[PDB]
A paper describes a structure:
Ribosomes are the ribonucleoprotein machines responsible for protein synthesis. Here, our goal was to investigate the structural conservation of the Enterococcus faecalis ribosome compared to Escherichia coli, a model organism for structure-based development of ribosome-targeting compounds. In the analysis of the E. faecalis 70S ribosome structure determined by cryo-electron microscopy (cryo-EM) to a global resolution of 2.8 Å, we find that structural differences are located predominantly in peripheral regions, while the organization of the functional centres and antibiotic binding sites remains conserved. The cryo-EM structure of E. faecalis 70S ribosome presented here revealed that the architecture of functional centres and subunit interfaces remain conserved when compared with E. coli and S. aureus.
In addition, we used focused classification of the 30S subunit to identify five 70S conformations. The 30S head domain is significantly rotated in four of the five classes (15.5° to 19.7°) resulting in 70S conformations with large rotation of 30S body and head domains. In our E. faecalis structures, the molecular map for the flexible linker region and the C-terminal domain is well defined in the unrotated head conformation in class 4 as well as in the rotated conformation in class 5. The superposition of both structures confirms that the C-terminal domain retains the same interactions with the 30S head domain in both conformations. This suggests that the bL31 C-terminal domain moves as a rigid body with the 30S head domain and that the length of the flexible linker region may restrict the extent of head rotation that is possible without breaking contact with bL31. We found in the E. faecalis structure that contacts between the bL31 C-terminal domain and the 30S head are maintained through a considerable range of head rotation consistent with a function in stabilizing subunit association.
Residue numbers in the entry:
A (entry chain U): 2 to 90
B (entry chain C): 2 to 276
C (entry chain 4): 1 to 44
The structure:
RNA sequence: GUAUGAGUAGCGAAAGACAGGUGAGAAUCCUGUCCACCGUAUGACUAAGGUUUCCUGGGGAAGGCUCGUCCGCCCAGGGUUAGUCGGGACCUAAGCCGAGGCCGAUAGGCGUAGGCGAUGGACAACAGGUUGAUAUUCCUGUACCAGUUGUUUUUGUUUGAGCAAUGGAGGGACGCAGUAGGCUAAGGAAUGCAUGCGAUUGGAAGUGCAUGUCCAAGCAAUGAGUCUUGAGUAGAGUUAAAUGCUUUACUCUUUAAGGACAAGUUGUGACGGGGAGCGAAAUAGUAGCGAAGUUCCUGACGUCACACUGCCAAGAAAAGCUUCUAGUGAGAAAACAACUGCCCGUACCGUAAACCGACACAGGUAGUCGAGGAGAGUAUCCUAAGGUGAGCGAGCGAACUCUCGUUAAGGAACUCGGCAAAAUGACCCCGUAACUUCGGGAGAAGGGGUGCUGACUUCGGUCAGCCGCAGUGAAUAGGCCCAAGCGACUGUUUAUCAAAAACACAGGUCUCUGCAAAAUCGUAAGAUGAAGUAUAGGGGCUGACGCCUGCCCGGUGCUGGAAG
């Protein structure tokens, strides 16, 4: 179903520094392999392997109004390339 | 023989143990060993049934023939070993086919005897004969109860028997403890008394040697509080106040003959003497 | 000295778990007796 | 909800002082200097447990036993990257669930086959660099394991090419104690490079101060050493088979030969990165530049390695692996090149302010590393690498309470009682009783020597000289003897008032119990006893060892009896 693989790019202080070595930080939905993300990126941007790396995130608190609730789980994806770029973001 | 340690400490004043001058090797075989546990007297349910168990060394079985059902093939016996399970020793056996097993070792077996096991085999030590082909007056072990189980009667160290005589059915046999009964005419045996004679002649000495063997201390009766034993209570040392001194459940100790009064064996037993 | 409530993660879910309270006819009594109140945490 | 106690008790073991910062406001925050504490730990790394406490930028209403510009607190943003690490797609121990099944008012209890279950088995990667936080995870270089695509040299599926069993077998495969031998780490000492020469009397070298004195996996070569005898002939067996495995008889062979393992070394890796120290180009000790790589001494229970001798209390399984046949059966099998390799954890604290104790609590917490001078040592005193200065203070120097130091003369007069303190204590040397179970008592008692310099010396010490009240000059380190009850002894005991004359204990004695044994748990199936078999197993009493263990069977229990 591989357009529900990738959601968003991550725009942070390390993620902009990953841009210099052709590395890109996407958010992949839960229960997805490394191989789906390779196939989805090759489908959507015409670039290659040089393997993905995949994280996870434990949630937090926040408090607003005497209430106590978590946030979402996440899963980052730091995809490296060999030969093309993405001046898209 | 028997060692006597020279008295150096206090827990060595009275120690005795065997020389183990009868045992050749110190390695068993791989194919004849099976594991064990220490059940510590505990059931499926896991409660203490038989008291005073558990908390010693480690052991393994040595799988020992009691049947001897190969016949007309000579057996070579080479090495004598040690059991942690039995008071008596064992022996390796080389059948000529290339089949090994362990066999209980009577007195007088040397390294390199050959023991024959058929119903036509002769009368020496260590031969397997059914209880028809044996003359009156021999000394016999591994007497079988039922035909086909292998041995269940007299197995341990330095014990003996005799055949007092035959009938057409059954065979009369004097066991140990003086008594006589009737054992069938299709039961195997071995000619000769069992090996080690000296297991009445050993001081354990320490307490910790009696806890090397898998035991545990037995508290006296009259020291328990009156809810753990019926002898209990009483301020000071007390005599046995109750008539006929009692086990911790009932059933007086000195005197109750307690077979089943309608046992099947009662037709076959003569001179129930020393029990 | 040692006091009691020394926690683990294997023991507090292989004693007070869920898969040991859908394995009797008394764990089921416990679960059904807690759902009458409407308690949020049913078990561990 | 608010008083009284009362602005009282307490502020939870420890050493700070000054200058300069920032700020409305400073003993309590930042920086600098000196001083001080631990240093077998208050130093480093991880397993549990905690669950964002981690980092960056702000804030001072409540928390912090005071203050607070600060914080493990409040707000906002942001950080945990794996073919090789620990776990799964591998195996099994204790135990648990257990198709059928066997029992049982219902409920349900027990159990074969098959499974689940690490604290254990088996398994392919090393060194450095990098950020505000991640690193056998990112990049730098060099490897390894299992595959897939094109090339590489051989055809009946007979095997003469392969593969090859859920079967035949080998192997994995194991205790405790004790010293002996070999390597490496770590350690120490000097005459190998680097800079600079004292402002307090003196010192250019040497007989001088401060500082640094190296390197991987993997691949090639070898090897201090360690273990083990090998060969043939004739038959039995391995449910059919086997060249595999086992085994019986006969002939040789033996410090020989064959085989198996092996810490470690030398090259390469490596023109690489590391380093005492120099030091900008803005506002950084930043970027960038690096000199030496020696010899002797001590040297590991870390490694070979459970290798070796000895002893009895006789010391886990299954898989991975290796062969032989059964079989299946176009023609795969070396080299080269290019690609593929899934899921979960990874921040942080981790002898603690972040775990267990309601607390930022004088308590508890498994494993590894754990330096120097004396020294047997992880003891004790002072220190290296490192980390702390304790989260209320300033004065004054009364009673009284606690913790310490000293005392004239007398030395148990105190007191239920020498309770508490005082005295002995290290190494070497002389000497040592009654009594005894011949091992002991025994460190019995009682005495003597110790520092520094020179000479002699084989070794070991001797001789001479010098000083002090005192020479193991500090800290650590048995008070002894004479009699008597009790218990033989080391052990165990009322967590939280009783540690003994109590219990256990080796030994003794009586009794029951012939195997579907007595006895016990259960309603029964079932199980323990026990895969044991009267030299064994249960029950009552006495408690090493030496000498002994008198009299009564009328009464009560037990056992035997047959007539009434």
């Amino acid at each position: 179903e591989l357009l529900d693989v990738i959601k968003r790019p991550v725009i942070t202080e390390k993620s902009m520094l990953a841009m210099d070595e052709k590395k890109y930080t996407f958010e992949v939905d839960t229960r997805a392999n490394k191989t789906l993300v390779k196939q989805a990126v090759e489908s959507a941007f015409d670039v290659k392997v040089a393997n993905v790396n995949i994280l996870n995130v434990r949630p937090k608190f926040k408090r607003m109004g005497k209430y106590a609730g978590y946030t979402k789980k996440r899963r980052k994806a730091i995809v490296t390339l060999t030969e093309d770029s993405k001046e898209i973001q | 023989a028997i060692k006597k340690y020279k008295p150096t400490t206090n827990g060595r004043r009275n120690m005795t143990s065997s020389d183990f001058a009868e045992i050749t090797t110190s390695t068993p075989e791989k194919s004849l060993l099976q594991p064990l546990k220490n059940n510590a007297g505990r059931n499926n349910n896991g409660r203490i049934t038989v008291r005073h168990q558990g908390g010693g060394h480690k052991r393994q079985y040595r799988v020992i023939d009691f049947k001897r059902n190969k016949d007309n093939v000579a057996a070579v016996v080479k090495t004598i070993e040690y059991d942690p399970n039995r008071s008596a020793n064992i022996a390796l056996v080389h059948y000529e086919d290339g089949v090994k097993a362990y066999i209980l070792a009577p007195k007088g077996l040397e390294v390199g005897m050959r023991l024959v096991s058929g119903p036509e085999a002769d009368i020496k030590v260590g031969n397997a004969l059914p209880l028809e082909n044996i003359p009156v007056g021999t000394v016999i072990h591994n007497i079988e109860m039922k035909p086909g189980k292998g041995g269940q009667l007299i197995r341990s160290a330095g014990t003996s028997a005799q055949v007092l005589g035959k009938e057409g059915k059954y065979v009369l046999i004097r066991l140990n403890s003086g008594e006589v009964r009737m054992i069938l005419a299709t039961c195997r045996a071995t000619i000769g008394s069992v090996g080690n004679e000296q297991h009445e002649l050993i001081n354990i000495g320490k307490a910790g040697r009696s806890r090397w063997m898998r035991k545990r201390p037995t508290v006296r009766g009259s020291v328990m509080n009156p809810n753990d034993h019926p002898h209990g209570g009483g301020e000071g040392k007390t005599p046995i106040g109750r008539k006929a001194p009692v086990s911790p459940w009932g059933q007086p100790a000195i005197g109750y003959k307690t077979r089943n009064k309608k046992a099947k064996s009662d037709k076959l037993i003569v001179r129930r003497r020393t029990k | 000295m040692k006091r009691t409530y020394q926690p683990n993660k294997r023991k507090r879910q292989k004693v007070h778990g869920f898969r040991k309270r859908m394995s009797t006819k008394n764990g089921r009594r416990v679960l059904a007796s807690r759902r009458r109140k409407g308690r949020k945490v049913i078990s561990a």
